[PDB]
Design a protein around this ligand. Structure first.
Ligand SMILES: CCCCCCCCCCCCCCCCCC(=O)OC[C@H](COP(=O)([O-])OCC(O)COP(=O)([O-])OC[C@@H](COC(=O)CCCCCCCCCCCCCCCCC)OC(=O)CCCCCCCCCCCCCCCCC)OC(=O)CCCCCCCCCCCCCCCCC
Ligand SMILES: CCCCCCCCCCCCCCCCCC(=O)OC[C@H](COP(=O)([O-])OCC(O)COP(=O)([O-])OC[C@@H](COC(=O)CCCCCCCCCCCCCCCCC)OC(=O)CCCCCCCCCCCCCCCCC)OC(=O)CCCCCCCCCCCCCCCCC
Ligand SMILES: CCCCCCCCCCCCCCCCCC(=O)OC[C@H](COP(=O)([O-])OCC[N+](C)(C)C)OC(=O)CCCCCCCCCCCCCCCCC
Lengths: 32, 110, 106, 365, 231, 161, 28
């Protein structure tokens, strides 16, 4: 939940369209 | 030492000859595809020798299909639901007759 | 499906092409044409999965005798090898290991 | 995390074709109890490439069903076996459905994965609600140019020896031999390093696959044998207008030949309107192809999948009566008449929903 | 591939895979001396010596037309033994055959020798054809070697020897030149050589799905009337 | 190279066009010479569907031709009534009635089902024979391992000294 | 280049600056 906000804010600044699947994959990529 | 040098050399040549048999067969098999798409007399030419054995069955009047085949697999497929399920006996000729007859003290040879 | 069309257009539904070409020739080939009964250079396909037998060593000698080294191998094996068959099968290393301990002593 | 759940396992080389377990990614749906969908990717293609497709809010596929992005044998994470028989691979899915406690599922596929999905409906029709095939057809494709290129790439990939070759040697070999950009990228991502940096290797079994393709005989993945039979259930086919795999001229006829309930073009068989482009096979990469496939997929899952053969749509469930054949019921004192066929819950075997609703029914009476 | 799925494929009324004593109503029954007046039977104990004499007859009468070809005689012996060793190695229990397996095979081989004595057996006509085609090829090689020319078989052997040197001179990391690698080198040369020859089309379908016959000429129509002979 | 024999025995009563012995293979060759090659149509449509109107004309021309020629056609229709009724009522069960009445009589189906399975076995011939060879090749490769060990003994004996 | 690969899968145009912020987010 906290790591979701970190990635979402990064994707927010680049005005890039983001989906929950991408965030879940990026978060899983961080822990992996 | 020269005894096993030549023994293992001949032993290897025997199984190298067997390896070339299986290798060359898989090589010729590359040009053969879909037996259902070849004519009758052309399929026999790929399997040279089958026509010769077919003539042997005909000239000796062994016209019972699968009589000389050890496993008449075609005979089992044809009789999967036959009454009195049986396959022809091995090397059964259509002309041989082993019937006997005896006379006993009782009737009907019993 | 069981409803393919009229009887006149029945031979139409058989063709299946591997390319995108139009119009498509309808005829579906049944067999391969065999106009001339030519003896094929190809070896017979009956020689497929036959186990090892006498023809293997008989043909090995015939091909070995085509060489000088092979002629020496065949002559020594058929004369000076105590075996009850030419179908040599290696199932143990008894004859191999005992030939090395009798040789490496020097 | 929650929506994306891929079970981790190690491929096991099996001598018995029945001790083969399949691994893949599971995508949880938006709602509590939804039927499941089992989808097969193209041969030697990543399951992850379809995750953005099945998790796109615009398409909203997960609102209908749970999706299993499953790898076939010798592919990805699943067990390896030299045989590629469609019947043996179909029985793998049935053991997967059993171990996962799935009574019946929708089947999907892309390319060769479409053949695999349709084969499962041919061998186990009572466990399959429908089949949605993307850019494929149950036909012998051994002589299609698109399959020959894939067959040629796999053969060239056998030349690489991971022990002796360096990473730069592999990158050069792939760029020079594999001219297709998508096949090149897919094959690079299949390369993975084992634990303890032992060596690199392809995720798919390159030896077993090459022999299947190089032999070019009945068991090849490009071939569709008559042995597979007929699929009796709901089937939908979608493919690009100019597709190198499915040619609109004649490659639709195999669909009528194998699928008994296919009505024809415009009802169960559609083509996506597009240009000539060798990459149009990968519909998930282009939004134009993906939007049409997703809408047709949502229409299949919502109204046509898992509906009785003689019913038009799902709207007729409960209001259309099907004629009955005489002397078809065990009851002798039975007045034969029309009936509405029974539709069952999607996982009725492994839940007690019929027992629970029986008791709630008695409380009313 | 494909396997028979019926588990009862080899079941007969007499047992599993029973092709020696099939079950029928008139089954064999014993005879008792004290109660038997007379009997009509054709069985005897002469099949063993008839089996020996038949082998000598078939061997000697076939060697009449071998023209002293020693290799052909030794090859024929190996083939003749494979015909007589059928009852000794077959899955069928030849000792449990209905009414005497020994008599049945001896009478079956006598029908073969009758054809052999007339030089009309198909195994004989097949041997003469195969040997003539073989000697014609051996004579072609002999004429090329006497002329100092190199045979087509020696060109491949010499070409294959230099391919192994080239592969083992570049493969220095590993030094195990397996028989698998040796084989695919020869097969790569064999396919290229076979494709080079002007052979009749053996496979049904060429690179495309179309057949490789003379009949596989479809539209478009682009051939004119056939032209006549030139003077 | 030793000089081989000039030729084998040449049978004076056996030829390729007149083989001495008989089989269905030679009969099959002469049969396809008679019916000729497969009459492959090079067109885009079959001949019947392209000429339906024309074939219908010639179809009815010969019907009228037979009808105009047969002045006693009513005598033939009446003469055919009895055998038409008799043979159809007698053979109805054996042809069609058995499919929904007392006995199925599936003998001819068993012959189709066995042949349909053989069609598949022939289609998978290359696969089944290749698996059988994989086991024989495994046995052959196992026997060739003893020669690989012997060829290293000379290097082992030299390096050990 | 795992960060580049996942972005490529979703067909999102990514700049070089975004990749570095993501790599620093994981490593940091
Ligand atoms: C002086 C003036 C008089 C002289 C004028 C001279 C001009 C004379 C005109 C003659 C024209 C000659 C040129 C065409 C010859 C062939 C005609 C034809 O239809 O061929 C196309 C047709 C298919 O061609 P295709 O489109 O390329 O498809 C290829 C696939 O193989 C297709 O196979 P598929 O199964 O995949 O597809 C369906 C297939 C389905 O068709 C079939 O496969 C088989 C159909 C049944 C065949 C006939 C069975 C007869 C059994 C024998 C019993 C009667 C024998 C008659 C003689 C007995 C003694 C009197 O065929 C079709 O496409 C649709 C059917 C088209 C009609 C064909 C059947 C009509 C009956 C023809 C038999 C005529 C004799 C019996 C009629 C009554 C007695 C007069 O081929 C055939 O049907 C072969 C049948 C035998 C041909 C020779 C028969 C004699 C000549 C036929 C003339 C027909 C009209 C007149 C009689 C009609 C009476 C009702
Ligand atoms: C030895 C055979 C019997 C001899 C009796 C004479 C024949 C019976 C007369 C009535 C005929 C109906 C019976 C069905 C016949 C079906 C056989 C058949 O067609 O072949 C199918 C068969 C294969 O097709 P399938 O589909 O598998 O057949 C099964 C059925 O579809 C259906 O499958 P399934 O498993 O259900 O069939 C089992 C079969 C089992 O049959 C038996 O096991 C026979 C029962 C044991 C024998 C009992 C007699 C005891 C004899 C010794 C005592 C006699 C003492 C006399 C005085 C002493 C004399 C010294 O049928 C029965 O169950 C018989 C029960 C009768 C049902 C009664 C129901 C009550 C009816 C109430 C209404 C009454 C209305 C009556 C109006 C008239 C009827 C239309 O082909 C073969 O087996 C070929 C081999 C031949 C078998 C042996 C010969 C039998 C005759 C075959 C036809 C002629 C062959 C030669 C021509 C071949 C082509 C050129
Ligand atoms: C079509 C045109 C040409 C026609 C040519 C004729 C075609 C005939 C096709 C073959 C059918 C032959 C039937 C033989 C009997 C087969 C059934 C059987 O074996 O019985 C097993 C039976 C059945 O056992 P079963 O186990 O096999 O079947 C069980 C049946 N069910 C499954 C229903 C339980 O068992 C017996 O032992 C009974 C023996 C009775 C014998 C009846 C046949 C006697 C007549 C045969 C000799 C006739 C010779 C005539 C020669 C004339 C010369 C002048």
């Amino acid at each position: 939940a906290p790591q979701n906000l970190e990635v979402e804010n990064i994707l927010k600044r680049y005005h890039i369209n983001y989906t929950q699947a991408l965030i879940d994959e990026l978060v899983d990529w961080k822990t992996g | 030492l020269d005894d096993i040098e030549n023994e293992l050399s001949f032993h290897a040549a025997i199984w190298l000859n067997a390896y070339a048999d299986y290798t060359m067969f898989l090589f010729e098999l590359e040009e053969y595809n879909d037996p259902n798409d070849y004519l009758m007399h052309e399929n026999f030419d790929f399997f040279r020798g089958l026509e010769t054995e077919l003539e042997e069955l005909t000239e000796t009047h062994n016209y019972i299909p699968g009589a000389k085949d050890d496993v008449n697999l075609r005979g089992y497929l044809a009789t999967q639901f036959a009454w009195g399920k049986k396959v022809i006996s091995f090397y059964r000729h259509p002309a041989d007759d082993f019937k006997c007859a005896k006379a006993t003290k009782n009737m009907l040879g019993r | 499906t069981l409803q393919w069309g009229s009887l006149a257009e029945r031979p139409m539904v058989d063709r299946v092409m591997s390319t995108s070409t139009w119009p498509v020739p309808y005829y579906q080939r049944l067999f391969k044409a065999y106009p001339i009964r030519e003896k094929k250079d190809k070896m017979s396909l009956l020689l497929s999965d036959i186990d090892i037998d006498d023809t293997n060593w008989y043909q090995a000698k015939d091909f070995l005798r085509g060489s000088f080294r092979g002629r020496q191998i065949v002559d020594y094996v058929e004369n000076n090898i105590a075996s009850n068959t030419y179908i040599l099968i290696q199932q143990d290393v008894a004859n191999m290991a005992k030939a090395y301990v009798h040789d490496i002593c020097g | 995390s929650r929506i994306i759940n891929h079970l981790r396992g190690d491929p096991v080389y099996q001598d018995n074709t029945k001790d083969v377990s399949l691994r893949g990614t599971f995508l949880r749906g938006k709602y509590d109890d939804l039927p499941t969908m089992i989808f097969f990717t193209e041969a030697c293609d990543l399951t992850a490439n379809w995750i953005p497709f099945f998790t796109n809010p615009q398409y909203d596929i997960l609102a209908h069903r749970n999706v299993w992005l499953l790898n076939p044998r010798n592919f990805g994470n699943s067990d390896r076996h030299p045989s590629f028989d469609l019947q043996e691979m179909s029985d793998d899915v049935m053991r997967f459905m059993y171990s996962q406690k799935i009574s019946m599922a929708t089947l999907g596929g892309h390319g060769i994965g479409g053949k695999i999905a349709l084969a499962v409906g041919c061998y186990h029709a009572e466990r399959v609600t429908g089949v949605f095939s993307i850019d494929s057809s149950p036909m012998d494709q051994r002589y299609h140019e698109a399959f020959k290129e894939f067959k040629g790439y796999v053969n060239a990939l056998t030349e690489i020896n991971f022990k002796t070759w360096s990473d730069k040697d592999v990158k050069v070999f792939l760029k020079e031999n594999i001219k297709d950009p998508k096949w090149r990228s897919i094959f690079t991502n299949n390369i993975s390093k084992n634990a303890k940096t032992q060596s690199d290797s392809f995720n798919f079994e390159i030896n077993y696959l090459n022999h299947n393709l190089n032999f070019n005989k009945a068991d090849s993945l490009g071939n569709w044998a008559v042995k597979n039979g007929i699929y009796t259930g709901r089937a939908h086919f979608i493919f690009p207008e100019y597709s190198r795999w499915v040619h609109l001229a004649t490659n639709t006829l195999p669909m009528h030949k194998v699928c008994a309930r296919v009505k024809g073009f415009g009802h169960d068989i559609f083509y996506v309107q597009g240009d000539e482009n060798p990459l149009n096979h990968w519909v998930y990469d282009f939004e134009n192809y993906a939007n049409v496939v997703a809408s047709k997929l949502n229409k299949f899952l919502h109204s046509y999948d898992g509906v009785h053969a003689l019913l038009k749509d799902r709207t007729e469930i409960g209001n259309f009566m099907i004629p009955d054949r005489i002397k078809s019921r065990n009851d002798s004192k039975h007045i034969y008449g029309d009936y509405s066929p029974a539709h069952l819950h999607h996982n009725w075997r492994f839940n007690h929903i019929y027992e629970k609703h029986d008791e709630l029914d008695k409380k009313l009476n | 591939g494909y396997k028979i799925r019926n588990k009862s494929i080899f079941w007969t009324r007499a047992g599993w895979k029973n092709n020696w004593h099939p079950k029928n109503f008139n089954a064999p029954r014993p005879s008792y001396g004290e109660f038997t007046m007379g009997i009509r039977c054709r069985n005897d104990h002469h099949s063993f010596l008839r089996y020996v004499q038949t082998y000598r007859n078939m061997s000697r009468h076939c060697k009449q037309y071998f023209l002293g070809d020693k290799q052909l005689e030794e090859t024929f012996i190996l083939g003749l033994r494979s015909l007589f060793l059928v009852p000794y190695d077959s899955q069928c229990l030849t000792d449990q055959i209905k009414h005497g397996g020994e008599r049945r095979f001896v009478d079956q081989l006598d029908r073969d020798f009758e054809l052999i004595s007339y030089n009309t057996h198909p195994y004989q006509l097949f041997t003469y054809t195969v040997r003539n085609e073989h000697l014609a090829w051996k004579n072609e090689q002999y004429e090329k070697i006497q002329k100092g020319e190199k045979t087509f078989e020696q060109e491949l052997l010499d070409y294959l020897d230099e391919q192994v040197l080239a592969e083992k001179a570049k493969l220095r990391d590993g030094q195990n030149f397996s028989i698998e690698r040796m084989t695919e080198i020869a097969l790569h040369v064999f396919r290229k050589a076979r494709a080079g020859k002007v052979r009749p089309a053996q496979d049904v379908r060429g690179p495309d799905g179309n057949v490789n016959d003379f009949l596989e000429q479809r539209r478009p129509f682009e051939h004119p009337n056939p032209t006549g002979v030139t003077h | 190279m030793k000089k081989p024999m000039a030729k084998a025995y040449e049978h004076p009563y056996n030829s390729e066009h007149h083989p001495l012995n008989f089989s269905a293979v030679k009969i099959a060759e002469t049969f396809h010479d008679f019916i000729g090659p497969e009459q492959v149509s090079p067109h885009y449509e079959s001949f019947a569907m392209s000429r339906k109107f024309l074939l219908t004309f010639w179809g009815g021309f010969f019907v009228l031709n037979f009808g105009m020629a047969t002045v006693d056609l009513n005598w033939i229709m009446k003469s055919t009534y009895i055998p038409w009724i008799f043979w159809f009522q007698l053979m109805y069960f054996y042809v069609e009635g058995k499919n929904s009445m007392f006995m199925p009589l599936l003998q001819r189906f068993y012959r189709r089902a066995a042949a349909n399975e053989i069609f598949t076995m022939e289609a998978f011939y290359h696969e089944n024979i290749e698996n059988k060879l994989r086991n024989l090749m495994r046995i052959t490769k196992g026997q060739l391992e003893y020669w690989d060990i012997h060829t290293s003994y000379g290097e082992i004996r030299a390096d050990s000294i």
